[PDB]
Design an enzyme around this catalytic site. Structure first.
Site, PDB file in Angstrom:
ATOM      1  N   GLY A 205       0.820  -1.202   0.000  1.00 34.53           N
ATOM      2  CA  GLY A 205       0.000   0.000   0.000  1.00 34.53           C
ATOM      3  C   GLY A 205       0.854   1.252   0.000  1.00 34.53           C
ATOM      4  O   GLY A 205       1.987   1.229   0.498  1.00 34.53           O
ATOM      5  N   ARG A 330     -10.706   1.584  -0.351  1.00 30.32           N
ATOM      6  CA  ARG A 330     -10.891   2.628   0.636  1.00 30.32           C
ATOM      7  C   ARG A 330     -10.986   3.987  -0.021  1.00 30.32           C
ATOM      8  O   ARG A 330     -10.699   4.155  -1.206  1.00 30.32           O
ATOM      9  CB  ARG A 330      -9.669   2.620   1.602  1.00 30.32           C
ATOM     10  CG  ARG A 330      -8.334   2.657   0.859  1.00 30.32           C
ATOM     11  CD  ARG A 330      -7.254   3.286   1.677  1.00 30.32           C
ATOM     12  NE  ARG A 330      -5.982   3.365   0.953  1.00 30.32           N
ATOM     13  CZ  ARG A 330      -5.563   4.422   0.268  1.00 30.32           C
ATOM     14  NH1 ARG A 330      -6.338   5.487   0.138  1.00 30.32           N
ATOM     15  NH2 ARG A 330      -4.382   4.404  -0.332  1.00 30.32           N
TER      16      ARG A 330
END
Length: 482
Positions: A205, A330
């Site tokens: 990420g 997200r």
């Protein structure tokens, strides 16, 4: 409505949420509170109608982090790296159960991309303002998401898992062909796809666990680096693409199978793979090609049973070809770009979705599709695809207590924040030219500050360049400009 409970009944939901635990800090914690509290004032004439619980590290408490006093309630958590606090799933659950809270918002970073968090929350009857466990892995894991994309018929660049395909699930045996179990299988994959390649950790990420590889001798140590950067994560190899446009599709899905796009974002302006300038909408792509990219993004989300906000990232060429890159499971920090052109309050939509409110019962979505703001009439989102159109243009610019909200006297259409490190400015305009102009003047006003003298100059320079003005940029643009 008199209360969150009445709102749920009136708007067709099934879960009363009066208290949310924020599993984050900084701008994320502040943005979630500000966006939701504005919606609560609009709905209940009480901005505190949905209460907020915050997690506080000794570091954040010593810094006098603004989100602490903003919160309705705060909980001191253990200090040090985020694995002991913000990213600790067991701690988040314990606090959620103890208050108790009815939902958790993780935001971006920390545990926002850990599939165990919604898993444990669901087991305890606690909602998650994000995708369910299943949808977060199959679309958030890079190897698995590329296999799902391939199953859906979405094009992908040559990679170690090219050819692999099959609500959906990726079986471990199929998944295991796509990854490179060791350096030796990797060297083989890199030779098949052909150099130059990218060794990428699938659980990586924010640009972590990615290495550019030009030849087989360089490969093993670069493979060892990716292993060390994101330990425990599977690894894949992909063809390093030509200079292209990097585009994103904003997704929003409810708990009922309804998923929509909230237009796109252009994030091609990058420096060492860090998103510098974002734009909303993504004007570079041909309307028909972007519509296809949007539908693919919706199909992909529907296939795995995605819920809440997500970002589908694509690599786009002048040819008119696009390739699925990844799905961000997200909200992103640059999400206000979309909020401003779509007139959708994203954290409020995440809250409403978690209360079981269908997309067609959210005022913002109703307006977007040109129907009554307070009606209960179901919307065929497929049949009304041409109906939503972006309202003006937005430019976001990355700039280099814990959070300082920066207000501009130069423009009503420009706002921003600075965090402690980096921040963002957001400039709306009736059109692209009008939005770039407002950003320049706002950055010039910001230039009068001491700490923002050198940093804002290179941005003003890039924004004024003919290539940027003419939207003739790519992913390698900034990196060759220096």
């Amino acid at each position: 409505v008199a209360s969150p409970a009445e709102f749920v009944t009136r708007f067709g939901g099934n879960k009363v949420i009066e208290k949310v635990l924020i599993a984050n800090n900084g701008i994320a914690a502040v943005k979630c509170m500000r966006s939701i509290r504005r919606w609560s004032y609009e709905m209940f004439r009480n901005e505190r109608a949905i209460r907020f619980v915050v997690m506080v590290t000794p570091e954040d408490l010593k810094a006098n982090a603004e989100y602490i006093k903003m919160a309705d309630h705060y909980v001191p958590v253990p200090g040090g790296p985020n694995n002991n606090n913000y990213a600790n799933v067991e701690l988040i659950l314990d606090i959620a159960k103890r208050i108790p809270v009815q939902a958790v918002w993780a935001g971006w970073g920390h545990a926002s991309e850990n599939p165990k968090l919604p898993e444990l929350l669901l087991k305890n009857g606690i909602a998650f303002m994000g995708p369910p466990s299943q949808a977060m892995w199959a679309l958030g894991d890079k190897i698995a998401s590329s296999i799902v994309a391939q199953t859906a018929g979405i094009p992908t660049l040559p990679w170690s898992g090219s050819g692999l395909r099959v609500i959906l699930n990726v079986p471990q045996e199929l998944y295991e062909k796509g990854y490179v179990k060791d350096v030796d299988d990797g060297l083989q994959a890199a030779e098949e796809v052909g150099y130059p390649v990218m060794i990428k950790a699938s659980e990586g990420g924010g640009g972590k666990g990615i290495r550019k590889v030009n030849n087989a001798d360089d490969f093993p140590n670069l493979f060892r680096q990716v292993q060390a950067e994101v330990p425990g994560s599977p690894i894949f190899v992909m063809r390093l693409a030509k200079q292209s446009r990097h585009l994103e599709v904003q997704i929003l899905a409810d708990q009922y199978g309804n998923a929509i796009s909230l237009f796109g974002r252009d994030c091609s302006v990058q420096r060492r793979h860090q998103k510098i300038i974002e734009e909303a909408p993504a004007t570079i792509a041909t309307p028909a090609v972007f519509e296809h990219m949007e539908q693919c993004a919706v199909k992909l989300a529907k296939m795995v049973g995605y819920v809440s906000a997500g970002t589908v990232e694509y690599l786009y060429s002048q040819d008119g070809s696009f390739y699925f890159l990844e799905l961000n499971p997200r909200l992103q920090v640059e999400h206000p770009c979309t909020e401003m052109v779509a007139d959708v309050n994203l954290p409020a939509a995440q809250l409403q979705i978690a209360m079981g409110i269908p997309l067609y019962r959210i005022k913002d979505i109703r307006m977007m599709y040109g129907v009554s703001p307070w009606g209960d009439s179901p919307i065929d989102f497929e049949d009304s695809a041409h109906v939503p159109c972006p309202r003006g243009h937005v430019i976001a610019a990355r700039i280099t207590g814990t959070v300082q909200e920066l207000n501009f006297r130069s423009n009503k259409n420009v706002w921003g924040y600075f965090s402690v490190q980096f921040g963002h400015c957001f400039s709306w305009g009736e059109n692209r030219e009008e939005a770039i102009s407002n950003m320049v003047v706002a950055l010039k006003e910001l230039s009068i500050r001491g700490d923002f003298r050198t940093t804002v100059e290179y941005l003003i320079k890039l924004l004024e360049t003919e290539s940027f003005q003419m939207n003739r940029i790519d992913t390698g643009w900034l990196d060759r400009l220096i």
